[PDB]
Structure formats: C-alpha cells, structure tokens
C-alpha cells in the first residue's frame, strides 16, 4: 500500500488537485490519499475530462474482517491495492478507468 | 452517498 506509486499518504484535496494539475489533467490520471475529513479512510482523486473528482474510501468490518468500499459495501476490497487494480480494468461506480498513476 | 464527495453523484 505505502509502497505503491499511486499512494500519496497525508495530502489535502487542494494538493491532490495541484499535483494532478502538474501532470496535465490527463483523462484517468489518479492518486490515492488519506482523507482529511475522514482520517480513518482514504480518497481516490481522479481526473476525468479535466475535472478532478474525489471518491471517499471507507473501512468497515464484517465478522471481524476489515474491508474497504466506495459504495457502502456494495463493492468490497481487502486493501487499496485490490481496489486500484480492479478499477484499472473495470469502471464500477467511476466515470472512467484508472489509467495513469499520479507520481 | 457522501456529502462532499463524488461517489454515485448525483
């Protein structure tokens, strides 16, 4: 998770937009960061048609087993890597695929 | 589903 190139740790929403702005507002450009409003969770910040969108990722526990979800448990992931890898191939609730990592 | 985020907007 921390090892992953697309993970930026504790950065703000404005900062994510500045970073995505640096790298040209390319469609499907993305990063994952910690949420400022929800420090227990994460945000997938994604550029689509030159607008940056922010998708909240929250932890939940089912029968003592942690999962992450962007849609109140309709789609569940063991960790951020699984979430990212799924959405590189499947749009799910997103408006586009995760195409390029914001470094 | 979350105020202030784009999840399943609108």
Place of tokens 């992450």: A68
Burial of A29 (0-12, 13-18, 19+ CB in 10 A): buried
| DSSP assignment letter at A33 | E
Reduced to 3 states (helix: H, G, I; strand: E, B; else coil), residue A66 is strand
Separation between Cα atoms, residue A59 and residue A3, nearest integer Å: 20
> Hey, how many other C-beta atoms are within 10 angstroms of the C-beta on A37?
12
Q: Which ranges of chain A would DSSP assign to H, the alpha helix?
A: 13-22, 80-87
Asked if A71 and B9 count as a contact pair (C-beta separation under 8 A), the reply is no
Separation between Cα atoms, residue B9 and residue A70, nearest integer Å: 12
Strand A51-62 versus strand A65-69 pairing type: antiparallel
Interchain CB distance below 8 Å, B7 and A37:
no
Interchain CB distance below 8 Å, B5 and A72:
no
| Chain A residues whose beta carbon lies within 8 Å of the beta carbon of residue B2 | 56
Separation between Cα atoms, residue A45 and residue A31, nearest integer Å: 5
Both tokens assigned to A94? 């997103």
Both tokens assigned to A59? 């932890």
Both tokens assigned to A6? 């697309």
Q: Does A55 touch chain B (CB under 8 A)?
A: yes
**CATH number, residue A27:** 3.30.505.10
| DSSP assignment letter at A71 | S
Separation between Cα atoms, residue B1 and residue A81, nearest integer Å: 23
Given in angstroms, what resolution was this structure solved at?
A: 1.6
Q: Work out how many domains chain A is built from and give that number.
A: 1
What does each C-alpha distance from A22 to A31, A36, A87, A103 come to in angstroms?
Answer: 13, 21, 23, 10
| Chain B residues whose beta carbon lies within 8 Å of the beta carbon of residue A14 | none
Q: Experimentally, how was this structure solved? A: X-ray
| Chain A residues whose beta carbon lies within 8 Å of the beta carbon of residue B1 | 71-72
Q: Which domain holds residue A90?
A: 1-103
């Amino acid at each position: 998770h921390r090892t992953q190139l697309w993970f930026h740790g504790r950065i703000s929403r404005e900062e994510s937009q500045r970073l995505i702005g640096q790298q040209g507002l390319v469609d499907g450009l993305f990063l994952v960061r910690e949420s400022q409003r929800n420090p227990q969770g994460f945000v997938l910040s994604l550029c689509h048609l030159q607008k940056v969108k922010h998708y909240l990722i929250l932890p939940s526990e089912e029968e003592g087993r942690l999962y992450f979800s962007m849609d109140d448990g309709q789609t569940r992931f063991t960790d951020l890597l699984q979430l990212v890898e799924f959405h590189q191939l499947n749009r799910g609730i997103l408006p586009c695929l995760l195409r390029h990592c914001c470094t | 589903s979350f105020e202030g985020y784009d999840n399943s907007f609108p």
